[PDB]
Design a protein around this nucleic acid. Structure first.
Ligand SMILES: [Mg+2]
Ligand SMILES: [Mg+2]
Ligand SMILES: [Mg+2]
Ligand SMILES: [Mg+2]
Ligand SMILES: [Mg+2]
Ligand SMILES: [Mg+2]
Ligand SMILES: [Mg+2]
Ligand SMILES: [Mg+2]
Ligand SMILES: [Mg+2]
Ligand SMILES: [Mg+2]
Ligand SMILES: [Mg+2]
Ligand SMILES: [Mg+2]
Ligand SMILES: [Mg+2]
Ligand SMILES: [Mg+2]
Ligand SMILES: [Mg+2]
Ligand SMILES: [Mg+2]
Ligand SMILES: [Mg+2]
Ligand SMILES: [Mg+2]
Ligand SMILES: [Mg+2]
Ligand SMILES: [Mg+2]
Ligand SMILES: [Mg+2]
Ligand SMILES: [Mg+2]
Ligand SMILES: [Mg+2]
Ligand SMILES: [Mg+2]
Ligand SMILES: [Mg+2]
Ligand SMILES: [Mg+2]
Ligand SMILES: [Mg+2]
Ligand SMILES: [Mg+2]
Lengths: 200, 172, 98, 169
RNA sequence: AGUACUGAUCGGGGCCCCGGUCAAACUCCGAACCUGCCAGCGCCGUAGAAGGGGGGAGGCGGGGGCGGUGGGGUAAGCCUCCGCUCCGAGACGGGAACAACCGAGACCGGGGUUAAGGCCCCCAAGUGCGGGCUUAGUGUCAAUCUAAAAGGGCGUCCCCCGCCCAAGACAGCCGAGGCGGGGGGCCCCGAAGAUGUACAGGGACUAAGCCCGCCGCCGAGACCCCGGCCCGCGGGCCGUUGGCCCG
RNA sequence: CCCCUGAAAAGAUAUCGGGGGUGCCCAAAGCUCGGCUCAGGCGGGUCAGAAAUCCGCCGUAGAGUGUAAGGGCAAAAGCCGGGCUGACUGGGCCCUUGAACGCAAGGGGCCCAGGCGGGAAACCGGGGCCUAGAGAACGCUCGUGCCCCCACCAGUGGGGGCCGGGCAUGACAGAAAAGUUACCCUAGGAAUAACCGGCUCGUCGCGGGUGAGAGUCCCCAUCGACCCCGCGGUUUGGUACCCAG
RNA sequence: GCCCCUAACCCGGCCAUAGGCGCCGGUGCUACACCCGGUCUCAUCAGAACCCGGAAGUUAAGGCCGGCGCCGCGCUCGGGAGUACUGGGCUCCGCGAGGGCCCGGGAAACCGGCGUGCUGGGAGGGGGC
């Protein structure tokens, strides 16, 4: 900036995307990283191997892939996070990845957060990810029961607020109170699609 | 492929008080006594050595006729025996002139055969077998100008060009 | 007064960095995987001095003998004596020259 | 003070880091620029004379001061302070040392001879190179003879041979 | 090199900008150079490289030249480091003498040719060749080694610049060059000591001095050659605690 | 012992060389996780002020990091808060002390096993961000083990042993130690002083350049501030080359 | 699945040609955002932040792209300059500290000119197998 003695930080640091102190500790593992990132509308899950010239992404997907299995819930809620991990987990397993280490970047590791839901989905597909037993969200939250309970209360309190806060839910034809039923349907379709693929 | 020019190098200064790095290089160039002379192929690695010993030797491009005379008068084989026309003919070289021209022109890349060279049958060797790889010269008739000054400012050391042949004829 | 011999005793110049190298170094040196027989160059990183080898090994070429956890066991020479340097990759660079 | 020949030659490294030198002497030159120093009035002057060193060596602070006094006094008298600019161009950064037995200068100074020989500060000098400008004058061409005389007087106070170079600005 | 970090420091202009002076314990830059690995060259090596074992030491006071302004010191044939070489432990030629400066490395005898250096006599080889300078015997072919500074001199030889003179310049009508500045070479003054002469080898020399060049010659134990001797290593023969022959 | 310089861009490097420091301190100033950003400046804000707490902007580190100096450090190596004791038990290998090249103690690094702390995890923790704060043999003492031994056998008391911690040598690779000799003695030393000599010349003595100023006027009849160049070996010193039968 | 091409997004390498200041434009189906709320997981003085649930509004800001100017920075470009410095040799100069010649290397400041991120993997989109 001002003068020759000014040291400009790393590009990814001044963009505010990479914590290089935490990234160094991840690379010391020499294991593939499960990279999970949150956007306003979608979630991103990637399985990455680090190489000296740049990282290599074995499998990468965002939550747009859920439309390929007829998902009608929101794009990036707890239920969508779990389904994304399942798809990534099976795809990663098909490529030979057995174990991964969770990499959440700048997000906070709050218990029950969506990053640990993606981890839970990845674990259930056979990819082992070390973790503590008090951060995975409860199965009710993964099934969307917290979404359905909220909408049911909204409808009987302010029926109009139900219409606005879930307008896109009504457009897709899936009312929020029926999310747990649909989540099982989508989860079954994903699991069956890949166990058969693995079998063949 | 590339044929480097062939140079004659003469040691002009003596052994005692010679600096250590210069003395080591002279030994590797086979100039281990004063007024000893060698012919080398001027590859870049060799020219780096001559630059190191520039203040102790004089050198220049040797001509085939001068080399022919040097071989006939100061060429020695194993046992410190004279090099004779008959010995050359036994090995397939017709004359002193032909082998000298073969070396100067680049047809052969070495004048004296190496230590581990093995002579075949019928095949003319690409060198002179058992020739000693150095020549012991006479002091120059009529003297030098100065063994302490460079040839470029009126002395005798360093690069001399084709005038090395005039000096060699006086030292034969 | 005689020379003092602390582990880092004449290392002001060696351990100094120019302004443009201030701060953390890049992580690519962490990601090279060395196998036995590889040639490495010991290039001390001053931001990790506690794991760095002695100043006498800066710029020397060694051969990787094996691994010890996360460090590499490197066989090198100081003059004529064989030395074993065990160090982490942040103080190593691949030797491309053979 | 010793004869200046004792400190004329450059025999070692410069000794100038006053934060490591105990009792480094203060500079005893009050001014370095004399005459008319303002840049606007110097535009009237169109000639430049320089007293240039001919050898490398060390000029003591008192010799620079003696040279500055004689030349500046001469120019003030004969040329006039409004008609010239004179600058002493070198600064005596180097500290001189002397190994003498003394009291009130440290216990090691009480050991005689070459034991603990590192000297205590004795003065200051400027280390100069050949061709270096010692004195610099700006003047009007009508006063050339007077400026040359002033620099001839300055040179007689200095420990090294010098020469006068006159050029236009 | 820079003055940009840490400091020092002289000026100008409106805490900033510009110019300047500096740094062993300052550094954006940054050589020569040294050094690691690999490949090649060169040389050494199966008549035995690397590596290893065993016996016996001496020695554990060093010194000279040159280079790191090494660092210190007023300086020292001084103190204390780093590197090549030499003396110690190395003959011999030159340096007037002289461990370590130059040349050069010696088995013995002889012949030849050179090195440093020299070639008027002492003293082997030139009263050698061209040009110029010095008038002071200045000086008399590097160092050890016997010397000289600031400063003054158109003393003399020379180079450059500025101005005047277009023949009405400089000097006191005359008729052709003149005035000032800067620098270089040699020499003069500055330059004063103690047993005995222009000391630095002596005679002496006006070149037998100095500067720019050049030609030939002399001159070591070096280099070349011949003869003799010895040695290391390898090979062979002989009934061998050893002898002899060959390369 | 430690840092910077000397040190001559690999390594090593000395002087009664230069600038400093060390014989500690801290249950946190040690471990880890998270959050945050410092010195300083500006704008606004009740006492309130140069400086207290509050809102905002700028701020490459101009702060801090126990302690010398040098080095490192900005979503940290700094500041604050949460949880802790790894300043851990048993061992191995390497680096440095100690260059290439023999050789203590001390210090550092990388690991394996046991059992923990922090953390979602990665990972980190065998003191302090790195380079200093460091002690043989004999003796004593403590810890440890279903431990080993004590003279023909068994028992009781007692003693000894192997492994580890400590009690100390700072002249720090480790004796337990005051003077005086002019009454002095011996072995030697020019490895080393005193006289003379050698080298050097700061000092001493002598000469020169310069010309501020004095001299009624007038630098130079006579002087000569401030400075500078020298000579002598005549004072004193520096050095330690020769000479201690 | 596979290969090729390709914006903004995700993970990177080198870590200013990437930074800084100012001005002028482009981009919005999708993607990135700003944005709407605080029942639930989690969070604080504070739903600002973090975390969760969303999709009414908007390209005003961020991100990304293009242009201009200045500062800073970069360059195997011209000059500076074969200068400074330097390895080896010298009975070459100088009273001396020091300089010179020959063989071999060879800067820096500064002035001018040019430049002002490059690139690896993935998603998404397009084309074929
Ligand atoms: Mg010699
Ligand atoms: Mg030592
Ligand atoms: Mg530590
Ligand atoms: Mg000195
Ligand atoms: Mg300078
Ligand atoms: Mg070096
Ligand atoms: Mg000794
Ligand atoms: Mg010596
Ligand atoms: Mg002896
Ligand atoms: Mg003699
Ligand atoms: Mg004669
Ligand atoms: Mg003098
Ligand atoms: Mg005379
Ligand atoms: Mg070094
Ligand atoms: Mg400490
Ligand atoms: Mg932290
Ligand atoms: Mg020791
Ligand atoms: Mg050793
Ligand atoms: Mg210690
Ligand atoms: Mg018994
Ligand atoms: Mg001791
Ligand atoms: Mg006497
Ligand atoms: Mg005496
Ligand atoms: Mg006096
Ligand atoms: Mg006078
Ligand atoms: Mg005396
Ligand atoms: Mg003595
Ligand atoms: Mg004597």
């Amino acid at each position: 900036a001002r003068g020759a003695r000014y040291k400009v930080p790393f590009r990814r640091r001044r963009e505010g995307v990479t914590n290089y102190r935490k990234r160094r500790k991840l690379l010391l593992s020499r294991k593939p990283r499960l990279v999970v990132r949150k956007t306003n509308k979608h979630l991103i899950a990637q399985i990455v191997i680090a190489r000296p010239h740049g990282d290599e992404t074995v499998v990468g997907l965002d939550t747009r892939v859920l439309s390929k299995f007829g998902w009608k819930g929101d794009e990036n809620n707890t239920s969508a996070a779990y389904l994304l991990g399942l798809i990534v987990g099976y795809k990663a397993r098909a490529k030979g990845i057995k174990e991964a280490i969770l990499d959440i970047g700048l997000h906070r590791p709050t218990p029950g957060a969506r990053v640990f839901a993606v981890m839970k989905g990845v674990i259930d597909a056979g990819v082992e990810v070390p973790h503590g037993e008090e951060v995975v969200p409860s199965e009710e939250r993964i099934r969307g029961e917290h979404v359905a309970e909220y909408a049911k209360r909204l409808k009987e309190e302010a029926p109009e607020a139900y219409k606005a806060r879930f307008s896109r839910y009504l457009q897709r034809g899936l009312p929020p109170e029926e999310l747990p039923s649909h989540f099982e349907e989508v989860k079954k379709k994903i699991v069956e699609y890949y166990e058969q693929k693995l079998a063949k | 492929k590339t044929v480097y020019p062939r140079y004659a190098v003469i040691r002009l200064r003596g052994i005692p008080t010679t600096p250590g790095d210069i003395a080591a290089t002279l030994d590797l160039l086979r100039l281990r006594r004063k007024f000893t002379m060698v012919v080398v192929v001027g590859s870049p690695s060799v020219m780096g050595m001559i630059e190191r010993v520039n203040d102790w030797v004089t050198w220049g491009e040797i001509d085939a006729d001068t080399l022919a005379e040097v071989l006939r008068k100061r060429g020695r084989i194993v046992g410190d025996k004279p090099l004779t026309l008959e010995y050359l003919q036994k090995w397939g070289w017709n004359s002193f002139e032909e082998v000298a021209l073969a070396y100067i022109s680049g047809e052969i890349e070495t004048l004296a055969c190496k230590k581990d060279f093995k002579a075949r049958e019928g095949q003319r060797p690409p060198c002179i077998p058992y020739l000693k790889p150095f020549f012991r010269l006479h002091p120059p008739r009529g003297g030098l100008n100065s063994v302490k000054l460079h040839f470029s400012v009126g002395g005798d050391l360093g690069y001399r060009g084709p005038l090395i042949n005039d000096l060699i004829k006086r030292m034969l | 007064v005689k020379r003092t011999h602390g582990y880092r005793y004449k290392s002001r110049k060696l351990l100094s960095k120019a302004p443009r190298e201030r701060g953390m170094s890049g992580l690519s040196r962490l990601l090279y995987e060395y196998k036995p027989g590889d040639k490495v160059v010991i290039d001390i990183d001053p931001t990790f001095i506690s794991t760095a080898p002695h100043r006498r090994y800066q710029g020397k070429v060694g051969v990787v003998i094996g691994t010890r956890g996360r460090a590499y066991v490197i066989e090198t020479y100081i003059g004529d004596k064989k030395k074993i340097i065990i160090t982490t990759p942040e103080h190593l660079r691949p030797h491309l020259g053979g | 003070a010793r004869p200046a020949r004792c400190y004329r030659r450059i025999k070692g490294p410069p000794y100038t880091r006053e934060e490591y030198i105990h009792g480094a002497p203060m500079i005893q030159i009050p001014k370095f620029d004399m005459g008319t120093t303002s840049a606007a009035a110097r535009a009237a002057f169109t000639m430049v004379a320089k007293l240039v060193a001919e050898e490398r060596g060390q000029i003591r602070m008192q010799a620079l001061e003696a040279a500055r006094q004689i030349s500046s006094k001469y120019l003030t008298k004969y040329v006039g302070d409004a008609n010239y600019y004179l600058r002493l161009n070198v600064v005596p950064h180097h500290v001189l040392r002397e190994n003498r037995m003394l009291a009130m200068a440290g216990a090691d100074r009480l050991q005689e001879g070459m034991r603990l020989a590192f000297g205590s500060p004795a003065g200051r000098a400027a280390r100069v190179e050949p061709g270096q400008v010692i004195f610099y004058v700006e003047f009007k061409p009508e006063h050339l003879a007077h400026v040359k005389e002033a620099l001839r007087r300055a040179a007689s106070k200095l420990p090294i041979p010098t020469r006068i170079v006159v050029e236009p600005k």
